Amino acid sequence: ALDKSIVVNLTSRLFADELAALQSKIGSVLPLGDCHRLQNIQALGLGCVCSRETSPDYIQIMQYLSKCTLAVLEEVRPDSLRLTRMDPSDNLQIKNVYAPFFQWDSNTQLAVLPPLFSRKDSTIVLESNGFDIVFPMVVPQQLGHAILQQLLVYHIYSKISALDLYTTNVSFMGRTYRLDVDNTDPRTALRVLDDLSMYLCILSALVPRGCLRLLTALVRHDRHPLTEVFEGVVPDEVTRIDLDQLSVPDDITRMRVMFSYLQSLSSIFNLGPRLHVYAYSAETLAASCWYSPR
Amino acid sequence: ALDKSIVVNLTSRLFADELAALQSKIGSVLPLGDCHRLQNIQALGLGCVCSRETSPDYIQIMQYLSKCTLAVLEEVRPDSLRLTRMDPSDNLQIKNVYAPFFQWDSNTQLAVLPPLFSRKDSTIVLESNGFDIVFPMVVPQQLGHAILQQLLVYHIYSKISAGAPGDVNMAELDLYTTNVSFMGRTYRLDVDNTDLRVLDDLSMYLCILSALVPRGCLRLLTALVRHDRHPLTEVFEGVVPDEVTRIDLDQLSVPDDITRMRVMFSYLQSLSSIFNLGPRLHVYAYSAETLAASCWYSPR
Amino acid sequence: ENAARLGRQVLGLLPPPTHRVSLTRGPEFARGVRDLLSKYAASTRPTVGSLHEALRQAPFRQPTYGDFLVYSQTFSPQEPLGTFLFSFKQEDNGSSMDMLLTPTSLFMLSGMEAAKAPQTHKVAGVWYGSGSGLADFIPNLSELMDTGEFHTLLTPVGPMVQSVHSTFVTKVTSAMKGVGLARDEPRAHVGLTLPCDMLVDLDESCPMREPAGLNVTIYASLVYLRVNQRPSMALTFFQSGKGFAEVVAMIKDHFTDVIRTKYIQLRHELYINRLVFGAVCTLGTVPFDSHPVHQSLNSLPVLVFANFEAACGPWTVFL
Amino acid sequence: ECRSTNNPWASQRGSLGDVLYNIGMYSPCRQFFHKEDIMRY
Amino acid sequence: HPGFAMTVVRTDEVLAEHILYCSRASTSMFVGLPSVVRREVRSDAVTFEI
Amino acid sequence: IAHGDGRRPNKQRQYIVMKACNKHHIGAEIELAAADIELLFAEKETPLD
């Protein structure tokens, strides 16, 4: 049988600091650069694409992860770091550590984020061999989109200054979470934001006249559960578009070209590759998952 | 390193009329809501979520299908059924009964859908365990993911007529929407002359989801100015309408926006997956008169 | 002789027995477990006889193929055996009918300019007619391109295996699911052949770091244009092992030249079918760190790969 | 049998539990009023 | 006081120990001959399956 | 019961019922250090320390 196998040789010993930072983390995900048995220390973590003196971003560093294949830890010996990678169809057992303790379940959908809560939380120091190992964070859908939801909010509002409670706290069901944003490189985030006028300006033109009329009937006297976001106040444009008699085959041919671009939003709202837990324990946190590249 | 033959317990026998109706089809793709095979009937099917009592919901059902492992039948036995568990890159065999019929062109993209039909030719009542077996809607994708295409516009104008009955023609809204035109073979849907309401979890969104789409791109243009700013956004003025660039933000102020903005941020990704996450098969070898094809699948 | 010699194939080609170990009867548990490690001590040592018994262990190697039909004029009479294969469907003429398109074919389906492809225009002129060689059988070349519907009916198939060229019908057996085995030359597989006109590389730059692997992905794309105010497409290919989120933001940087002149046109006219742009298909993953082998045919510079697993994703829209 | 019922206000043909408990969270009073629960066991 | 009286349902979970009884010779057991399948086996670790 | 004398039974019947087995699944793991495997089975058969 096949044996995928990665073990990291080391030239100078783990210290008492980075032992307990790594002996405690016996199962997680960290990337690689090259697929071998052996590996130098300066290719393991997220610390290649990001560093301390280089101003990081929160887009391209995540976007870098789609290139790599990513591996699962096995052991932390005082010489070597023992790992194994992810075969395109094979089950494993991974058990997360993370100090933002989030609750998974069986039959979930997990991805891997770069650390957006706090960097010093994630950036461990390596006094022996210098090169830090920044840990990526294993994350489900409901969080994994919500911070990407949180990002494309804030880097618009990074210019609307030129504040803090409205624009960074991750509105999870139960808790809120401040991110770590002071000094970023938001120009790759500036692309994705200007990639929205590629869509959100252009999706607006072929909006049909029929479904817009439901908005005028809605907010007056037929108030629905979630729709109190409008707070009983229309947008100004809603009465400024509905002048058409509702011609049907116009709006038929409008919704076909609309229906194309909904699949186009996958290519701009991507995560990393995808995890398929089927069996899971909550008190143990160990899972059973096969690899799906995305 | 293989065993795909899963025997799933009943607690009693079948009925008498449901012999040949379950001999009418012998192979279909059922879900399997249990990693183990030592399994009740009350967890395999859509009756763990979708039944009479729960609200008519679409997105959680859309979440459920790729969440749940599938299985392909081989033979109907009086004690129990025979499920063959879905692995990635799995061979199987289909001998269909689906009402209405949907033609199985080979080598296209062949998806799995949530049903919306009349539930008399769409389920089989087991009062032996209190479990209506729910075959999933299995339609090829260009028909399948675009079955929502004609229905949705047909669905929205019924809502405005439910509050103002002087707006919409009925027999003209039927004709372009009641008949899906693909391959040249026209297919008629099931009309529901009872009182659709399953699609409240899409169309009631999509009208709210059409509110601030020409509002979000006012401030978005003039925001993040560089000369490194993108070149095609100057070209993309030739799309946006004339009334869109005439909105005053006197009405809505900056800290007031945060709740109203993030909702419009929210449904531009949650909607993007539910047309992409339709897990899907392909036929390499097909038979027409026999309706016994050999094909392959990978859930996605 | 049949029981004598031909058994010694099948007396040896069998898979190994999953070795059976007796739990109870304690004098037989040790007789079992002793003959595991003496079987395991072979698979460690690099000596000669220890090697070849670590080779009967084999994974699942069985991809299935496709028996098609071709009107043998729509077949260009030679093929480089590793082409891409489309399957165009509008309506069934007969019971079991099919039509196929190569990457040399789709240049001849619009009558496009020689500026977008000055390499295969001299090539693919002798292989077919003058664009009307496939207009005899489809009167809907325009309206699929007009309404934006050509980019959905093409079903990606894969590479060839071997085709039998006859007088009226050319019988084609394509390849799917992975590794396409060749026929005339055994032990070597079907080398998928892409031209040097159509594959666009994504990696080239100054020296200025990227991760390697076993995974570079070939993308099937489609870019609209309207030359002479006529509906016309463009076959363009790619090669990139750099994830999905990057390349849709990189194909748009490649085809910025189309979009700039495009809305110069429809600035003063609105046709809703003229607003959709294109789609992406994924065909399979070449091992990244391998070689696109520059091979010359009929001129016609062609890249060819090795060990190409194949897949097919849906056509995903982009701008 | 000296009386036929405690009250029809819980035992109407259209009883108040059928008014309430025929139609996510947990439901304690679902156990008597739902007629199909009688049909379960 | 309103003119009606009213009934209340209250559920209740109880973890409770139990007593299981069995009788003689109700099940006939068997013995399989198991196989040995290696998986994910390095020069470091040699892991099995039964 | 034997016949007669004001006692009328429901005389001998024979059930013939085919019953089903019930499968079960037991999974277990064994690890071995590959160093100790080699010393017990060497190509040379000199004794060990």
Please tell me the distance from the alpha carbon of residue D10 to that of residue D15, in angstroms, as a whole number: 5
Pairing of strands B29-32, B69-73: antiparallel
Q: Report helix angle B147-161 to B200-208, nearest 10.
A: 70
- CA-based end-to-end distance of chain E: 71
Please tell me the distance from the alpha carbon of residue A156 to that of residue A190, in angstroms, as a whole number: 8
The total of other beta-carbon atoms located within 10 Å of residue A66's CB is 19
- CA proximity to E37, closest of E45, E48, E46: E48
- CA proximity to C103, closest of C259, C262, C303: C303
**Tokens linked to B186:** 């026209």
Closest residue on chain F to C37 (Cα): F37
The total of other beta-carbon atoms located within 10 Å of residue A61's CB is 19
Please tell me the distance from the alpha carbon of residue B220 to that of residue A156, in angstroms, as a whole number: 7
Closest residue on chain B to A252 (Cα): B153
Please tell me the distance from the alpha carbon of residue B193 to that of residue B48, in angstroms, as a whole number: 28
Please tell me the distance from the alpha carbon of residue E9 to that of residue A82, in angstroms, as a whole number: 57
Please tell me the distance from the alpha carbon of residue B235 to that of residue B249, in angstroms, as a whole number: 25
**Which residues lie below 8 Å from residue C241, measured CB to CB, with a gap of 6+?**
A67, C213, C215, C216, C217, C285, C288
Interface contact D29-E9, CB threshold 8 A: yes
Amino acid at site C162: Q
Q: What is the largest CA-CA distance in chain F?
A: 91
SS3 F20: coil
How distant is the Cα of D4 from the closest Cα of chain B, in angstroms?
31
**Tokens linked to C142:** 């325009």
How distant is the Cα of C56 from the closest Cα of chain A, in angstroms?
10
SS3 C172: strand
Q: Phi and psi at residue C301, in whole multiples of 5°? A: -80, 130
Please tell me the distance from the alpha carbon of residue A47 to that of residue A27, in angstroms, as a whole number: 19
8 Å CB contact between A78 and A19:
yes
| Resolution of the PDB structure in angstroms | 4.2
Q: Phi and psi at residue A250, in whole multiples of 5°? A: -60, -55
Q: Phi and psi at residue C22, in whole multiples of 5°? A: -80, 125
User: What experiment produced this structure?
Assistant: cryo-EM
Instruction: Return the half-sphere exposure (C-beta side, CA atoms, 13 A cut-off) of residue A91.
Output: 10
**Tokens linked to E47:** 């892991």
Pairing of strands A81-84, A6-8: antiparallel
| CA dihedral over C114, C117, C118, C120, signed as positive or negative | negative
SS3 E45: strand
Q: Which residues of B186-222 are buried (b: 16+ CB within 10 A; e: fewer)?
A: ebebeeeeeeeebbbbbbbbbbbbbbbbbbbbbebbe
Pairing of strands C100-101, C216-223: unpaired
Amino acid at site C214: L
Contacts of C316 in chain A (CB under 8 A): 263-264, 266-267
Q: Backbone dihedral region of C187: left (phi > 0), alpha (psi from -120 to 50 degrees) or beta?
A: left
Instruction: Check residue B269 and report its DSSP letter.
Output: T
Interface contact A214-B159, CB threshold 8 A: yes
Closest residue on chain C to E36 (Cα): C19
Please tell me the distance from the alpha carbon of residue A115 to that of residue B77, in angstroms, as a whole number: 53
**Tokens linked to A143:** 């969080």
Instruction: Give, in order, the Cα–Cα distances in Å from A63 to each of A68, B124, B137.
Output: 10, 48, 36
Please tell me the distance from the alpha carbon of residue A247 to that of residue C271, in angstroms, as a whole number: 16
**Tokens linked to C101:** 């398109």
What's the burial of F5, exposed, middle or buried (CB within 10 Å: 0-12/13-18/19+)?
A: exposed
| CA dihedral over A242, A244, A246, A252, signed as positive or negative | negative
- Give the per-residue SS3 of C263-318: HHHCCCCCCHHHCCCEEEEEEEEECCCCCCEEEEECCEEEEECCCCEECCCCCEEE
Please tell me the distance from the alpha carbon of residue B271 to that of residue B176, in angstroms, as a whole number: 25
Q: Phi and psi at residue B26, in whole multiples of 5°? A: -125, -20
Amino acid at site C85: L
8 Å CB contact between C65 and B283:
no
**Tokens linked to C19:** 């070795």
Please tell me the distance from the alpha carbon of residue B7 to that of residue B28, in angstroms, as a whole number: 15
- Give the per-residue SS3 of chain A: CCCCCEEECCCCCCCHHHHHHHHCCCCCEEECCCCCCCCCHHHCCCCCCCCCCCCCCCCHHHHHHHCCCEEEEEEECCCCEEEECCCCCCCCCCECCCCCCCCCCCCCCEEEECCCCCHHHHEECCCCCCCCEECCEEEEHHHHHHHHHHHHHHHHHHHHCCCCCCCCCCCCCCCCCCCCCCCCCCHHHHHHHHCCCCCHHHHCCCCCHHHHHHHHHHHHHCCCCHHHHCCCCCCCCHHHHCCCCCCHHHHHHHHHHHHHHHHHCCCCCCCCCEEEEEEECCCCCEEEEEEECC
Amino acid at site B238: G
Chains that touch F (3 or more CB pairs under 8 A): B, C, E
Element (H, E) at C256: helix C256-265
Interface contact E7-D28, CB threshold 8 A: no
Please tell me the distance from the alpha carbon of residue B178 to that of residue B118, in angstroms, as a whole number: 15
Instruction: Check residue C4 and report its DSSP letter.
Output: T
| CA dihedral over B40, B46, B51, B54, signed as positive or negative | positive
**Which residues lie below 8 Å from residue F12, measured CB to CB, with a gap of 6+?**
none
Please tell me the distance from the alpha carbon of residue B64 to that of residue B62, in angstroms, as a whole number: 5
Please tell me the distance from the alpha carbon of residue A46 to that of residue A31, in angstroms, as a whole number: 7
Instruction: Give, in order, the Cα–Cα distances in Å from B176 to each of A249, A253, B19, B150, B151.
Output: 7, 11, 40, 7, 10
Q: Is F40 on the interface with C (CB under 8 A)?
A: yes
- CA-based end-to-end distance of chain C: 68
Pairing of strands B179-182, B29-32: unpaired
Strands, E assignment, C68-139: 86-87, 100-101
Chains that touch B (3 or more CB pairs under 8 A): A, C, D, F
- CA-based end-to-end distance of chain F: 79
SS3 content of chain B, % helix, strand, coil (to 5): 25, 20, 60
CB nearest D40 (choices: B53, B54, B130): B130
